[PDB]
Design a protein around this ligand. Structure first.
Ligand SMILES: *CCC(=O)Nc1cc(Nc2nccc(-c3c4n(c5ccccc35)CCCC4)n2)c(OC)cc1N(C)CCN(C)C
Length: 280
């Protein structure tokens, strides 16, 4: 099927410019005419351009409440990616910073929303290849979205990286599927339930392939009942088709979000501004 997505090109004079390592910035996008101010994030060598344009290609082709939307690109010195600003940051830093305030309702609901976004990416025949808690931003504490499609690939499995989030098949053979994304989903859920701990903390990345082959996995988080930990372990099966599907992960965590304290045991449980989701 033809990809009739629209690539929107933005005037640099329509911005009023967060993180470097390229550089991501924050700003306002004021389209000429319409009295409207959109809070945006602006991400500022031939290779780079091919890669930002590949990432821009992917984001322009997805449209889902739990996937980061692309607003457009600006064609200057280096190409800029303009996306919706997510004010609360990435989810990895957020659960670390608010460790003493994350309730089981928020944890289980984020798991539902991430699986919804990943399930949508599967519908678009898209393999994310880099699902992690650092790549999930927070619009509001009640609403998260998946991001960072720099590694994403469109399927017609994929034959080609963060070692501690990828499946054993991805490490041994470089094969990626939606089912290898389920593995990364499992590590991401583990990251949330441990309030931001680092997976396999201390183990260099080179022995990870040996550890997982001999049968070892990530430990059971303290707040996690066996019901939640079982779902994680299922995401880490050797046999990729034995792992759960994102549509099933939605159903399972949905049921748990209706009785959160049964599955997570936690102690003590600017005027014309328009968010990008309302500027269609
Ligand atoms: C987890 C780090 C981070 O995201 N911090 C952050 C982010 C935003 N808002 C926002 N909105 C859309 C996209 C992004 C973003 C950033 N980075 C990437 C990389 C790949 C894809 C998207 C993307 C790299 C790191 C910077 C942002 N970010 C935000 O809104 C005010 C505030 C923050 N924080 C918490 C500041 C970062 N802090 C660690 C100094």
């Amino acid at each position: 099927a033809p990809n009739q997505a629209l690539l929107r090109i933005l005037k640099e004079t329509e911005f009023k410019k967060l993180g470097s390592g390229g550089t991501v910035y924050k700003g306002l996008w004021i389209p000429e005419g319409e009295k409207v101010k959109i809070p945006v994030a602006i991400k500022e060598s031939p290779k780079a351009n091919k890669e930002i344009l590949d990432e821009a290609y992917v984001m322009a082709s997805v449209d889902n409440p739990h996937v980061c939307r692309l607003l457009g690109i600006c064609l200057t010195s280096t190409v800029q990616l303009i996306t919706q600003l997510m004010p609360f940051g990435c989810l990895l830093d957020y659960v670390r910073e608010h460790k003493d305030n994350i309730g089981s309702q928020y944890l289980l609901n984020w798991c539902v929303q991430i699986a919804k976004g990943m399930n949508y990416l599967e519908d678009r025949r898209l393999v994310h290849r880099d699902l992690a808690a650092r790549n999930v931003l927070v619009k509001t504490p009640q609403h998260v979205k998946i991001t960072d499609f720099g590694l994403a690939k469109l399927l017609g499995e994929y034959h080609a990286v963060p070692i501690k989030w990828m499946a054993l098949e991805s490490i041994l053979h470089r094969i990626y599927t939606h089912q290898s994304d389920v593995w990364s989903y499992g590590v991401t859920v583990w990251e949330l339930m441990t309030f931001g701990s680092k997976p396999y903390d201390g183990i260099p990345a080179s022995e990870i392939s040996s550890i997982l082959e001999k049968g070892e996995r990530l430990p059971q988080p303290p707040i996690c009942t066996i019901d939640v930990y079982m779902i994680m372990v299922k995401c880490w099966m050797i046999d990729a088709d034995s792992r759960p599907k994102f549509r099933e992960l939605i159903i399972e965590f949905s049921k748990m979000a209706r009785d959160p304290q049964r599955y997570l045991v936690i102690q003590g449980d600017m005027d014309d501004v328009v968010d990008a989701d309302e500027y269609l």
